[PDB]
Every structure is written in C-alpha cells, then in structure tokens.
C-alpha cells in the first residue's frame, strides 16, 4: 500500500480565469477527482490525504503565529471514499489569500511522517497542484529536500501551464520548482512537472 498526499493550492489567484478558460482551481479539481474515483472504484489499497494551502482558515498541526498559516488538512491519511469525492467535488472552494507552498509541502511531509509510523507503506508521494502565483520563503530549503530524500518521499507538480503571460511570482515559482525537482532526480525529476491537461489525459487510459 502507498500513501499519497494531494497538496492543492486554493489561493485567490487559483480562481482567476483568462480568456474564458477554465480556472486552474477547476482544472486541479478535475485531475484530483479523476484520480480519486479511479482509486475508489478500483478497490485500490492506497491511502490518500488532502492538504489545502490558501484557505481562509488555518487548521494543521504545525500552525503557529506566522508559521504555516492558511494551511488546512482536509483529509487525513486513509482510504478514499465517496464522501471524499463529494467533498472535493462540491465542498472544497477557493480561498481569499495566498499561502506559502513550501510551508504546505512541510505540512504534507509532517502528515506522512506522523501518520505512517509503524504501518508498512511501499511508496510515499506528494502531489502538488498550483499555479505558483503565491509568494513563499526559501528558509531552510535544503533541509526540506534532504528530508524528502531521507524519507523517500517522491514529488510531483501539476500546473496550468508548461515551463515556458506569467506573473513575476509565477516565474519565480517555476525556477524554485525546477530547482527542487532537479536536486531530487535531475532530468528525470524535471519530467515530473505536468500540466493539468496532460495529467487528465494520462489518467484516462486503463
């Protein structure tokens, strides 16, 4: 059995549309929905968790004054169910703020480390869905990466664009993501940054 954390960006900008295109919040939702129900209807033994960053409410274990703010744990590590599908499909809504995605990554890493004790898991994975239009601090980044390697936590990013009308912060986020992914697995790591469109296509074949 594997443990997967869906780290979804629900910031204000996630609801912004361009030229009538589907907002990245909707795109990320479709990908998450298609993945979840595929796990549910397949009787998969993989347990899923969902962390949200950008929520107007703060609800995580590491939350403190100016520490991991606007990050909420929507679903703890357990098997996916029809309730989760209903929640992701109609309950989860975008927030009014922009949270630090690296703080969210840490929360996801802490959620796995704490809720995986003793239990035997074959793979630990974190999937991030975001438009990268949120500011973030790089404090102790090298420690985050080392713990990802030490804990054997693979990583994937899903964006509304390819790596090439982007904002300043969005361009800054791209480089940080590519930096992280290259340090984890080099070229093979860079190929683990997908678009919502591409991911939706792959998740519709067997």
């Amino acid at each position: 059995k594997s443990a997967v954390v869906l780290c979804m960006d629900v910031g204000l900008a996630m609801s912004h549309s361009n030229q009538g295109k589907e907002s990245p919040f909707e795109q990320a939702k479709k990908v998450m929905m298609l993945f979840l129900q595929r796990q549910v209807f397949a009787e998969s033994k993989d347990e899923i968790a969902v962390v949200l960053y950008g929520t107007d409410t703060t609800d995580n274990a590491l939350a403190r004054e100016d520490q991991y703010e606007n990050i909420s744990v929507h679903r703890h590590l357990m098997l996916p169910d029809f309730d989760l599908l209903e929640q992701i499909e109609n309950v989860v809504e975008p927030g009014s703020v922009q949270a630090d995605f690296l703080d969210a990554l840490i929360v996801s890493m802490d959620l796995l480390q704490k809720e995986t004790l003793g239990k035997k898991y074959t793979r630990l994975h974190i999937a991030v869905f975001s438009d990268l239009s949120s500011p973030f601090s790089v404090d102790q980044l090298e420690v985050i990466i080392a713990n990802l390697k030490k804990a054997e936590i693979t990583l994937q990013f899903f964006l509304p664009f390819s790596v090439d009308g982007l904002s300043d912060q969005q361009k800054e986020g791209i480089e940080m993501v590519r930096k992280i992914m290259f340090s984890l697995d080099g070229e093979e790591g860079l190929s683990e940054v997908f678009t919502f469109r591409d991911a939706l296509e792959r998740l519709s074949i067997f």
């Binding site: 520490q67 890493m109 480390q113 601090s137 102790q140 420690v143 985050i144 713990n147």
Partner: peptide, 11 residues
C-alpha cells in the same frame, strides 16, 4: 521569513 521546522526534520 523565519521558519520553524518540526523536530523530526532535524535529526
């Protein structure tokens, strides 16, 4: 901005 990592990430 200063960040406080969990203790287990400091072993």
């Amino acid at each position: 901005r200063k960040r406080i990592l969990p203790t287990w990430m400091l072993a």
